Amino acid sequence: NRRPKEDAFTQQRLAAINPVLTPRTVLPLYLLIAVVFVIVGGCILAQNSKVDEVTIYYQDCMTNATSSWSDIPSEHWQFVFHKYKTYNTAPQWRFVDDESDDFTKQRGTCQIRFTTPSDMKNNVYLNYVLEKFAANHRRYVLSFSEDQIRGEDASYETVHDATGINCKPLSKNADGKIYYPCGLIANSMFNDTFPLQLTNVGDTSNNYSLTNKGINWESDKKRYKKTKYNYTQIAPPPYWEKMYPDGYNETNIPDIQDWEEFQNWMRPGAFDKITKLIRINKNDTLPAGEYQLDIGLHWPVLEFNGKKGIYLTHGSHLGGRNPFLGIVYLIGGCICAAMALILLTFWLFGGRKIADASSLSW
Amino acid sequence: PIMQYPRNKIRTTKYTPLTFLPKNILFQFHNFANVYFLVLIILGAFQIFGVTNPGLSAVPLVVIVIITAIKDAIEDSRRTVLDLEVNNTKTHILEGVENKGVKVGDIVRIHNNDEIPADIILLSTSDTDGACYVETKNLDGETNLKVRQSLKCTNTIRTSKDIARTKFWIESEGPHSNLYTYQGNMKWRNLADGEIRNEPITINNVLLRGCTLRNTKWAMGVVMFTGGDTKIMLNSGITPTKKSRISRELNFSVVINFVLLFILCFVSGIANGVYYDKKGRSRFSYEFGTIAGSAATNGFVSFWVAVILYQSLVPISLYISVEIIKTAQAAFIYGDVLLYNAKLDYPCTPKSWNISDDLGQVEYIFSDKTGTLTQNVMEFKKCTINGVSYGRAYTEALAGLRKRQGIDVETEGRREKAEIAKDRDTMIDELRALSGNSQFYPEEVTFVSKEFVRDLKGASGEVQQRCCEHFMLALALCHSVLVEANPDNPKKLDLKAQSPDEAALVATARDVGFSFVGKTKKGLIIEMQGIQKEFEILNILEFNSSRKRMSCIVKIPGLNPGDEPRALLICKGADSIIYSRLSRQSGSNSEAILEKTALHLEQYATEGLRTLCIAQRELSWSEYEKWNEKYDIAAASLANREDELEVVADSIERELILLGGTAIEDRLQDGVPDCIELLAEAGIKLWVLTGDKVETAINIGFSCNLLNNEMELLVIKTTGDDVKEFGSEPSEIVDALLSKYLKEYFNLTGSEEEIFEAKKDHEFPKGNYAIVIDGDALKLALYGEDIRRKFLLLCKNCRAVLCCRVSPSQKAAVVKLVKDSLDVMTLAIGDGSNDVAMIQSADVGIGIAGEEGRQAVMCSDYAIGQFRYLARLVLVHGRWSYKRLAEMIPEFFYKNMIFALALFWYGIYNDFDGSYLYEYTYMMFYNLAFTSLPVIFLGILDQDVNDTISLVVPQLYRVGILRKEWNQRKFLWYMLDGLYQSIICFFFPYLVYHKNMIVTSNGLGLDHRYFVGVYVTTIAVISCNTYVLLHQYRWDWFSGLFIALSCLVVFAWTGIWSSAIASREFFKAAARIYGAPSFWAVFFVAVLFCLLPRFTYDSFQKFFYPTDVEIVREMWQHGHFDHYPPGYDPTDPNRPKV
Ligand SMILES: *[C@@H]1O[C@H](CO)[C@@H](O[C@@H]2O[C@H](CO)[C@@H](O[C@@H]3O[C@H](CO)[C@@H](O)[C@H](O)[C@@H]3O)[C@H](O)[C@H]2NC(C)=O)[C@H](O)[C@H]1NC(C)=O
Ligand SMILES: Nc1ncnc2c1ncn2[C@@H]1O[C@H](COP(=O)(O)OP(=O)(O)CP(=O)(O)O)[C@@H](O)[C@H]1O
Ligand SMILES: [Mg+2]
């Protein structure tokens, strides 16, 4: 007896809320969405109007500045303070060469001296902006070793594995020894040493500190682990050999776990603007006045006509200052309230009414 | 080994389970959308095309390869476990201790009434020297008892104790696949004596496989040799499968998806040639130059890296996604109880699973009748003998109910009043039933009680008494009806015939007194009025539906003693064939009786009775013995399965003396209420193709209300039916007469034969115009060039086309004409072995399973219980499976390019060097697990209206006849809707990073490109799955769950894979991204801008250009369908009122 089963699934009689888009459910729906996104779009422009940031580029402290306090191109600096009180004043910078490190392409010390009229809140972030740095190509971001990130004393053919990330450009030095951080990512690290303080020059000289601990995520110290090599078979990468001039001692091998500004650099930014954290200060609210950063220039940004800068901010809940998410929720409010208005004035003032049943075949 | 004998299974499915896998894998890559994945796997192993996880590239392919393998496993198992339990299900005993299953050299005993899976070479049986009868029904139209005269020499075996003393089989040559031939001969060596003997083995000594033996016992002989020596292994079994329009308008849509993929790689392949000849870039100092060499051919490699990058654009889960939906929609056609025939134990049986959407776009139903539309239990007689009509009926004299009064029940009591006055007095010397609903026509036939003692024969007068008795004896001798031993009440034996017509002639001749008791080995025995006369039928010629000659040549005895006994020829056929074979000039009264009886044939077809008439020539044996030699040499000829026996069965039927005609009735299948307002008010144009005549088919189209009143019955009606052999070169009549009103009926529909302005047009034509073209008026209409178009355009602007399509080549040629010359779906529902030519030459193949499963069911595309279920099969289970599968296929090319273009818009910002954005698990689980489930449960569980309301308003099927759902104008505007949302799902995640690259609330930075592809994928998954939510009707608990589960699987694979250390760069992204409120602010507002164009446009359509299926759904929510119950079947015999 092959009768088919009758248990409301081979008979297709499920729950079936059955939505019909009548104009008394769509027109309250657009009244519901557009009354949310003009309150969310207001509250995001309420929050993000109150964000204070400092963007100052310094790729031409080496040439376009003197040893005295020098010219300030307005192409470089961008203060965004919501109390427009000291916004047109210029941040000046000098240049201290000292002619000892004989590199002549990026050397010396640019000492930017800016001025913050308002007070930031307790968290203060000192980023660095690297525009026009091509950080996202095919050969570039697939050049490191994951085991050397995870603290492994790998061999020459185990940094040449087929699986994605290897170190095919940076495999060995002249005498056949492997590199300790291999691959073009760790080779191409931002050098410029920011100091651990913002010196409070001019006024009172009670300095404002900036810790370099707590920079990466603290949860990232489970795949960055200390080395296990034998201090002889590793070489520094060929663009690090002027911070490790002799090679590796028994005591100069960098612990990549706590060296947090290296952990940021092994996380390549997606686009041709790169903004990574290098100095934080969770403890102290920054007071108003005039501060000075002493940037040790080492990283070349002139062979590709790029930029290099400083992003000082107090990052809000959305992160940074961007007027995008305030405009977009208002565009979400402006279109939904217009599509409600177009589909109501074509309804009551001409158009159709849902009053018949002889529209299909009459 | 040397004798080359391997063993084989019986049925020849090419997917042998030892060679299942390598033949499937080559078949999987005849598709050119997964052999494209074999290119980007072997290019993912070469470690220059920037690819991480090279072994995870065979995950999104081989999962689809194995799911198609277990799909093809189920599509091989159902073709062998449900339709094919006849391979080996019986094992014969074959005991040899005193020294359905296959063995070469076996000596198999075959009893009566069983099918033989062997090529048995007969030896002997219970009859005289191996006289074997057979019903060879599953080979040809052979419903005879074909004699298989076995070896007349070795008839000495009786049991399996003496034939079991020889272990021997013969050697034969290769196969030939011809039915009537057998070129094998056996030679054997007798024991203890040197007698050599070649027993001659011909087609009379053997019988084939697919036939059913009758009337004999212990048929014995030898099974075939291995290979293909069975003559049904090649004549039938190699059938080409079929696919839909949407499965043929898909291979255009795939190539349009490959045109776009070839452009997005070509734009990428040149923009990284333009990038690698700049001078002031960053790739000179930090990244090391001369990657491959000192040329700019690292933009040609960057072409190939975009091919590997754009692998979620090639549709891999397409040809598995249609075959999950086509299978599940067909297994819902199967598993419906309202398509289950309780009186037969038979649900709907989908023979072809892959054509569930053909039932939503059909326009022409070629439903020929008398098997399909009717009940085919032939009852009445309404006898018309000697130019006078004896019979009174009011069961169906109601075909002319247009002009009569309200109710007439007193004549239905007067039928019963004459019924009790007819059974009692005719019970003189008859021992049959003769009761209520045992006899069939109440008519006082001449009041036969005249002789008591004075005379027995008469021969003085009252010729009407003789002419009625001579009619009934010639009626009960011209038949192929078999008696049968009645198991309960064995005192009344019954009748069994393969034709429901032919059984009714004897069974009422039984009721008047002329019944036949049985059949002897040569002649026939018949109990005519007490005495049992033995009419020796020495020869019969069979019946075919292409000839309409049921004719026996039964020999009668000479009434005077001492003569040569003459013979009759009762050529019982149609009411136009034997009038085309009738003696015109005569010394008899065979002229003035014709206009009496042919007037009654018009009277007894205009009330809805099937007519079949009886003629008889009084031939002698001075002329028969040469025709019998001309027939038996033609019977000994090679043309016994051809039409050269027809020219021998033509020469003796040239002149005839007409006896009379019958008017057997046929009530309906009660497939009336579907044909009125369900299956013809939808928009489908029915085409009945009877083979019965014109007056009976017009007056049955009114009865089922196929054609109602106010139908302009523009009958074609040619006037002459003659064959041409010479002359008529300067002028023409018999072809020019129908040709001049194929133009003259173009005053009703003004058109011309030149151009097809109607191939590009679909409508259910205003103006009724039921064409009643008939028989030879169709043979002279599809003759050659430039004659079809001047009525095929007339047959487009009709609503019904009608009868007399006999000799099924015309039913083949009509369904081929309206399918080829107008590219549209046909349906062709039929039953019976003469309608397989109409079913196998159409698009859909619906078959009716009657009491037995016939060849138009086992060579079909579906099978339903009655015609009553076609209104549910087409208007519900086909209209849904069109609007489901024509909604799924635009949604699947949409979902592949909301994703695979969002890593093209990232290609601008890495200058098209081919860096991945999606971690290579979100590119690998996207076609498979992320958002490939709600597209499936859109194609399986979507219903625009309920199952009852698809039959209350059947004109919702017009969205499928017009092809007003699936077209390329729908296909491109979903890809343009995807390419819109690819900009939204990338540049809303991009324009929060482009300002200062900081998105976290604690400033720690999510600048990495794998941490951007979670902003992109979560917008590309949720705004994909909510899009499918807004494009299904009736959100249920099931598909509404697998949207809430397929959105909460991208939030769950991000939590359990960004918590392992195996995710190298993607270590802990569940805590970093989802803790950041910039994710949940760009997720709630870039899901909006993906839906907001389509949701307003599908609110601007549904308010001011609303479809017919929106207006019905507005009536669903209000009190317009409150009176209809659930599970409502309006074509049901016993149902309540609305
Ligand atoms: C980080 O600082 C170093 C120095 O403190 C920057 O200079 C790079 O230093 C290496 C080693 O001194 C230079 O390699 C040299 O290249 C010349 C040919 O250009 C070759 O003749 C020498 O024998 C030696 O191999 C390298 O050119 C120099 N500059 C660059 C752009 O790499 C370095 O630029 C700073 N940045 C990075 C990302 O390392
Ligand atoms: N066994 C039989 N004896 C005498 N006449 C028969 C017959 N079988 C069929 N006929 C006649 O042949 C004519 C056409 O033959 P056909 O094969 O069409 O029968 P039919 O139309 O009833 C079945 P179908 O409708 O599927 O063609 C009918 O008018 C019928 O009267
Ligand atoms: Mg039929």
PDB file of N, CA and C in Angstrom, chain A residues 45-108:
ATOM      1  N   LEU A  45      26.486  62.036  14.594  1.00  0.00           N
ATOM      2  CA  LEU A  45      27.042  63.372  14.396  1.00  0.00           C
ATOM      3  C   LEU A  45      27.121  64.159  15.697  1.00  0.00           C
ATOM      4  N   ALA A  46      26.382  63.754  16.729  1.00  0.00           N
ATOM      5  CA  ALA A  46      26.579  64.377  18.033  1.00  0.00           C
ATOM      6  C   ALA A  46      27.876  63.902  18.674  1.00  0.00           C
ATOM      7  N   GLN A  47      28.199  62.617  18.521  1.00  0.00           N
ATOM      8  CA  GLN A  47      29.408  62.078  19.132  1.00  0.00           C
ATOM      9  C   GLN A  47      30.650  62.474  18.348  1.00  0.00           C
ATOM     10  N   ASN A  48      30.592  62.377  17.023  1.00  0.00           N
ATOM     11  CA  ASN A  48      31.772  62.528  16.185  1.00  0.00           C
ATOM     12  C   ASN A  48      32.065  63.983  15.839  1.00  0.00           C
ATOM     13  N   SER A  49      31.190  64.913  16.214  1.00  0.00           N
ATOM     14  CA  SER A  49      31.551  66.321  16.136  1.00  0.00           C
ATOM     15  C   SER A  49      32.507  66.725  17.243  1.00  0.00           C
ATOM     16  N   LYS A  50      32.579  65.939  18.315  1.00  0.00           N
ATOM     17  CA  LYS A  50      33.337  66.273  19.509  1.00  0.00           C
ATOM     18  C   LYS A  50      34.660  65.524  19.582  1.00  0.00           C
ATOM     19  N   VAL A  51      35.207  65.120  18.442  1.00  0.00           N
ATOM     20  CA  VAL A  51      36.459  64.374  18.404  1.00  0.00           C
ATOM     21  C   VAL A  51      37.573  65.322  17.986  1.00  0.00           C
ATOM     22  N   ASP A  52      38.678  65.300  18.725  1.00  0.00           N
ATOM     23  CA  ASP A  52      39.817  66.170  18.477  1.00  0.00           C
ATOM     24  C   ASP A  52      40.994  65.336  18.000  1.00  0.00           C
ATOM     25  N   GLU A  53      41.556  65.702  16.852  1.00  0.00           N
ATOM     26  CA  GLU A  53      42.666  64.958  16.284  1.00  0.00           C
ATOM     27  C   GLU A  53      43.754  65.928  15.855  1.00  0.00           C
ATOM     28  N   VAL A  54      44.954  65.387  15.670  1.00  0.00           N
ATOM     29  CA  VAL A  54      46.116  66.137  15.208  1.00  0.00           C
ATOM     30  C   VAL A  54      46.805  65.304  14.142  1.00  0.00           C
ATOM     31  N   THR A  55      46.858  65.821  12.920  1.00  0.00           N
ATOM     32  CA  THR A  55      47.574  65.176  11.828  1.00  0.00           C
ATOM     33  C   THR A  55      48.649  66.129  11.338  1.00  0.00           C
ATOM     34  N   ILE A  56      49.908  65.721  11.464  1.00  0.00           N
ATOM     35  CA  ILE A  56      51.049  66.533  11.058  1.00  0.00           C
ATOM     36  C   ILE A  56      52.008  65.638  10.296  1.00  0.00           C
ATOM     37  N   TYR A  57      52.279  65.984   9.049  1.00  0.00           N
ATOM     38  CA  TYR A  57      53.217  65.236   8.231  1.00  0.00           C
ATOM     39  C   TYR A  57      54.611  65.826   8.376  1.00  0.00           C
ATOM     40  N   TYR A  58      55.625  64.972   8.239  1.00  0.00           N
ATOM     41  CA  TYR A  58      56.986  65.437   8.454  1.00  0.00           C
ATOM     42  C   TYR A  58      57.972  64.840   7.462  1.00  0.00           C
ATOM     43  N   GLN A  59      57.520  64.481   6.261  1.00  0.00           N
ATOM     44  CA  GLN A  59      58.431  63.906   5.276  1.00  0.00           C
ATOM     45  C   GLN A  59      59.444  64.908   4.733  1.00  0.00           C
ATOM     46  N   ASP A  60      59.252  66.204   4.977  1.00  0.00           N
ATOM     47  CA  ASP A  60      60.214  67.215   4.566  1.00  0.00           C
ATOM     48  C   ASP A  60      60.681  68.062   5.742  1.00  0.00           C
ATOM     49  N   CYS A  61      61.043  67.420   6.852  1.00  0.00           N
ATOM     50  CA  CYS A  61      61.844  68.098   7.862  1.00  0.00           C
ATOM     51  C   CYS A  61      63.317  68.082   7.513  1.00  0.00           C
ATOM     52  N   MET A  62      63.728  67.191   6.615  1.00  0.00           N
ATOM     53  CA  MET A  62      65.141  67.051   6.309  1.00  0.00           C
ATOM     54  C   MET A  62      65.627  68.169   5.395  1.00  0.00           C
ATOM     55  N   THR A  63      64.805  68.586   4.434  1.00  0.00           N
ATOM     56  CA  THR A  63      65.196  69.619   3.482  1.00  0.00           C
ATOM     57  C   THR A  63      64.507  70.952   3.741  1.00  0.00           C
ATOM     58  N   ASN A  64      63.188  70.945   3.915  1.00  0.00           N
ATOM     59  CA  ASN A  64      62.407  72.170   4.009  1.00  0.00           C
ATOM     60  C   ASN A  64      62.350  72.742   5.420  1.00  0.00           C
ATOM     61  N   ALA A  65      63.309  72.401   6.274  1.00  0.00           N
ATOM     62  CA  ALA A  65      63.417  73.006   7.590  1.00  0.00           C
ATOM     63  C   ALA A  65      64.880  73.292   7.883  1.00  0.00           C
ATOM     64  N   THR A  66      65.113  74.303   8.714  1.00  0.00           N
ATOM     65  CA  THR A  66      66.451  74.690   9.117  1.00  0.00           C
ATOM     66  C   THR A  66      66.698  74.256  10.558  1.00  0.00           C
ATOM     67  N   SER A  67      67.901  74.548  11.055  1.00  0.00           N
ATOM     68  CA  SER A  67      68.211  74.262  12.449  1.00  0.00           C
ATOM     69  C   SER A  67      67.475  75.194  13.399  1.00  0.00           C
ATOM     70  N   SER A  68      67.126  76.394  12.951  1.00  0.00           N
ATOM     71  CA  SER A  68      66.204  77.224  13.702  1.00  0.00           C
ATOM     72  C   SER A  68      64.772  76.799  13.396  1.00  0.00           C
ATOM     73  N   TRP A  69      63.831  77.360  14.145  1.00  0.00           N
ATOM     74  CA  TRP A  69      62.431  76.992  13.980  1.00  0.00           C
ATOM     75  C   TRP A  69      61.897  77.595  12.689  1.00  0.00           C
ATOM     76  N   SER A  70      61.382  76.740  11.815  1.00  0.00           N
ATOM     77  CA  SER A  70      61.350  77.002  10.385  1.00  0.00           C
ATOM     78  C   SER A  70      59.915  77.114   9.872  1.00  0.00           C
ATOM     79  N   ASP A  71      59.798  77.159   8.544  1.00  0.00           N
ATOM     80  CA  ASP A  71      58.532  77.360   7.850  1.00  0.00           C
ATOM     81  C   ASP A  71      57.573  76.204   8.116  1.00  0.00           C
ATOM     82  N   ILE A  72      56.285  76.512   8.054  1.00  0.00           N
ATOM     83  CA  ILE A  72      55.221  75.556   8.318  1.00  0.00           C
ATOM     84  C   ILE A  72      54.282  75.559   7.121  1.00  0.00           C
ATOM     85  N   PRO A  73      54.472  74.652   6.168  1.00  0.00           N
ATOM     86  CA  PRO A  73      53.503  74.530   5.075  1.00  0.00           C
ATOM     87  C   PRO A  73      52.173  73.995   5.578  1.00  0.00           C
ATOM     88  N   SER A  74      51.091  74.632   5.130  1.00  0.00           N
ATOM     89  CA  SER A  74      49.748  74.196   5.490  1.00  0.00           C
ATOM     90  C   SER A  74      49.290  72.981   4.698  1.00  0.00           C
ATOM     91  N   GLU A  75      50.078  72.542   3.715  1.00  0.00           N
ATOM     92  CA  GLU A  75      49.867  71.229   3.121  1.00  0.00           C
ATOM     93  C   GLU A  75      50.105  70.122   4.140  1.00  0.00           C
ATOM     94  N   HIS A  76      51.025  70.339   5.077  1.00  0.00           N
ATOM     95  CA  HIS A  76      51.416  69.285   6.002  1.00  0.00           C
ATOM     96  C   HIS A  76      50.428  69.146   7.155  1.00  0.00           C
ATOM     97  N   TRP A  77      50.265  70.193   7.954  1.00  0.00           N
ATOM     98  CA  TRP A  77      49.540  70.048   9.205  1.00  0.00           C
ATOM     99  C   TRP A  77      48.034  70.139   9.002  1.00  0.00           C
ATOM    100  N   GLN A  78      47.298  69.370   9.807  1.00  0.00           N
ATOM    101  CA  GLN A  78      45.839  69.437   9.862  1.00  0.00           C
ATOM    102  C   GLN A  78      45.407  69.257  11.310  1.00  0.00           C
ATOM    103  N   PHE A  79      45.108  70.353  12.000  1.00  0.00           N
ATOM    104  CA  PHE A  79      44.451  70.260  13.295  1.00  0.00           C
ATOM    105  C   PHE A  79      42.950  70.237  13.074  1.00  0.00           C
ATOM    106  N   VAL A  80      42.260  69.357  13.788  1.00  0.00           N
ATOM    107  CA  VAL A  80      40.805  69.347  13.815  1.00  0.00           C
ATOM    108  C   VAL A  80      40.406  69.388  15.283  1.00  0.00           C
ATOM    109  N   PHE A  81      40.114  70.582  15.780  1.00  0.00           N
ATOM    110  CA  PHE A  81      39.621  70.785  17.131  1.00  0.00           C
ATOM    111  C   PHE A  81      38.228  71.388  17.056  1.00  0.00           C
ATOM    112  N   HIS A  82      37.290  70.812  17.810  1.00  0.00           N
ATOM    113  CA  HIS A  82      35.900  71.236  17.703  1.00  0.00           C
ATOM    114  C   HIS A  82      35.634  72.585  18.354  1.00  0.00           C
ATOM    115  N   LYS A  83      36.540  73.066  19.195  1.00  0.00           N
ATOM    116  CA  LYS A  83      36.526  74.446  19.664  1.00  0.00           C
ATOM    117  C   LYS A  83      37.515  75.205  18.787  1.00  0.00           C
ATOM    118  N   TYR A  84      36.998  75.906  17.776  1.00  0.00           N
ATOM    119  CA  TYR A  84      37.837  76.583  16.784  1.00  0.00           C
ATOM    120  C   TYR A  84      38.420  77.851  17.399  1.00  0.00           C
ATOM    121  N   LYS A  85      39.439  77.663  18.230  1.00  0.00           N
ATOM    122  CA  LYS A  85      40.066  78.762  18.954  1.00  0.00           C
ATOM    123  C   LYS A  85      41.534  78.964  18.610  1.00  0.00           C
ATOM    124  N   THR A  86      42.292  77.894  18.386  1.00  0.00           N
ATOM    125  CA  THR A  86      43.711  77.969  18.054  1.00  0.00           C
ATOM    126  C   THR A  86      43.983  77.051  16.861  1.00  0.00           C
ATOM    127  N   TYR A  87      43.129  77.171  15.843  1.00  0.00           N
ATOM    128  CA  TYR A  87      43.132  76.252  14.712  1.00  0.00           C
ATOM    129  C   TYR A  87      43.992  76.731  13.556  1.00  0.00           C
ATOM    130  N   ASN A  88      44.210  78.036  13.438  1.00  0.00           N
ATOM    131  CA  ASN A  88      45.005  78.583  12.351  1.00  0.00           C
ATOM    132  C   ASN A  88      46.466  78.799  12.721  1.00  0.00           C
ATOM    133  N   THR A  89      46.844  78.548  13.973  1.00  0.00           N
ATOM    134  CA  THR A  89      48.217  78.753  14.410  1.00  0.00           C
ATOM    135  C   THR A  89      49.107  77.611  13.945  1.00  0.00           C
ATOM    136  N   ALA A  90      50.368  77.930  13.707  1.00  0.00           N
ATOM    137  CA  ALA A  90      51.140  76.924  12.996  1.00  0.00           C
ATOM    138  C   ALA A  90      51.998  76.107  13.958  1.00  0.00           C
ATOM    139  N   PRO A  91      52.110  74.802  13.714  1.00  0.00           N
ATOM    140  CA  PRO A  91      53.083  73.989  14.456  1.00  0.00           C
ATOM    141  C   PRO A  91      54.463  74.014  13.815  1.00  0.00           C
ATOM    142  N   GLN A  92      55.451  74.559  14.510  1.00  0.00           N
ATOM    143  CA  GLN A  92      56.771  74.739  13.927  1.00  0.00           C
ATOM    144  C   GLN A  92      57.676  73.556  14.238  1.00  0.00           C
ATOM    145  N   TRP A  93      58.657  73.347  13.364  1.00  0.00           N
ATOM    146  CA  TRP A  93      59.603  72.258  13.537  1.00  0.00           C
ATOM    147  C   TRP A  93      60.986  72.688  13.075  1.00  0.00           C
ATOM    148  N   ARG A  94      61.999  72.197  13.778  1.00  0.00           N
ATOM    149  CA  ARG A  94      63.397  72.396  13.435  1.00  0.00           C
ATOM    150  C   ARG A  94      63.983  71.083  12.935  1.00  0.00           C
ATOM    151  N   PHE A  95      65.293  71.075  12.718  1.00  0.00           N
ATOM    152  CA  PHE A  95      65.970  69.876  12.236  1.00  0.00           C
ATOM    153  C   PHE A  95      67.383  69.851  12.801  1.00  0.00           C
ATOM    154  N   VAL A  96      67.739  68.756  13.464  1.00  0.00           N
ATOM    155  CA  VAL A  96      69.028  68.597  14.127  1.00  0.00           C
ATOM    156  C   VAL A  96      69.728  67.420  13.459  1.00  0.00           C
ATOM    157  N   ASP A  97      70.706  67.712  12.604  1.00  0.00           N
ATOM    158  CA  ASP A  97      71.302  66.671  11.773  1.00  0.00           C
ATOM    159  C   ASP A  97      72.394  65.903  12.511  1.00  0.00           C
ATOM    160  N   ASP A  98      73.413  66.627  12.996  1.00  0.00           N
ATOM    161  CA  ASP A  98      74.580  66.202  13.784  1.00  0.00           C
ATOM    162  C   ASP A  98      75.618  65.406  12.989  1.00  0.00           C
ATOM    163  N   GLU A  99      75.264  64.986  11.766  1.00  0.00           N
ATOM    164  CA  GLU A  99      76.176  64.498  10.719  1.00  0.00           C
ATOM    165  C   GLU A  99      77.063  63.344  11.205  1.00  0.00           C
ATOM    166  N   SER A 100      76.450  62.396  11.900  1.00  0.00           N
ATOM    167  CA  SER A 100      77.189  61.270  12.451  1.00  0.00           C
ATOM    168  C   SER A 100      76.822  59.930  11.840  1.00  0.00           C
ATOM    169  N   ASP A 101      75.605  59.777  11.330  1.00  0.00           N
ATOM    170  CA  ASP A 101      75.116  58.492  10.854  1.00  0.00           C
ATOM    171  C   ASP A 101      75.192  58.332   9.341  1.00  0.00           C
ATOM    172  N   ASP A 102      75.781  59.312   8.639  1.00  0.00           N
ATOM    173  CA  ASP A 102      76.246  59.345   7.243  1.00  0.00           C
ATOM    174  C   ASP A 102      75.360  58.634   6.219  1.00  0.00           C
ATOM    175  N   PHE A 103      74.047  58.662   6.435  1.00  0.00           N
ATOM    176  CA  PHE A 103      73.114  57.979   5.552  1.00  0.00           C
ATOM    177  C   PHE A 103      72.620  58.891   4.438  1.00  0.00           C
ATOM    178  N   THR A 104      72.416  60.178   4.747  1.00  0.00           N
ATOM    179  CA  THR A 104      72.181  61.295   3.824  1.00  0.00           C
ATOM    180  C   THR A 104      70.903  61.188   2.997  1.00  0.00           C
ATOM    181  N   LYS A 105      70.093  60.158   3.224  1.00  0.00           N
ATOM    182  CA  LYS A 105      68.809  60.013   2.555  1.00  0.00           C
ATOM    183  C   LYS A 105      67.643  60.245   3.500  1.00  0.00           C
ATOM    184  N   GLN A 106      67.760  59.779   4.745  1.00  0.00           N
ATOM    185  CA  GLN A 106      66.806  60.120   5.797  1.00  0.00           C
ATOM    186  C   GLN A 106      67.550  59.983   7.120  1.00  0.00           C
ATOM    187  N   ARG A 107      67.995  61.111   7.664  1.00  0.00           N
ATOM    188  CA  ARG A 107      68.752  61.129   8.907  1.00  0.00           C
ATOM    189  C   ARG A 107      68.424  62.416   9.648  1.00  0.00           C
ATOM    190  N   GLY A 108      69.011  62.572  10.826  1.00  0.00           N
ATOM    191  CA  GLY A 108      68.779  63.769  11.603  1.00  0.00           C
ATOM    192  C   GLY A 108      67.674  63.590  12.615  1.00  0.00           C
TER     193      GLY A 108
END
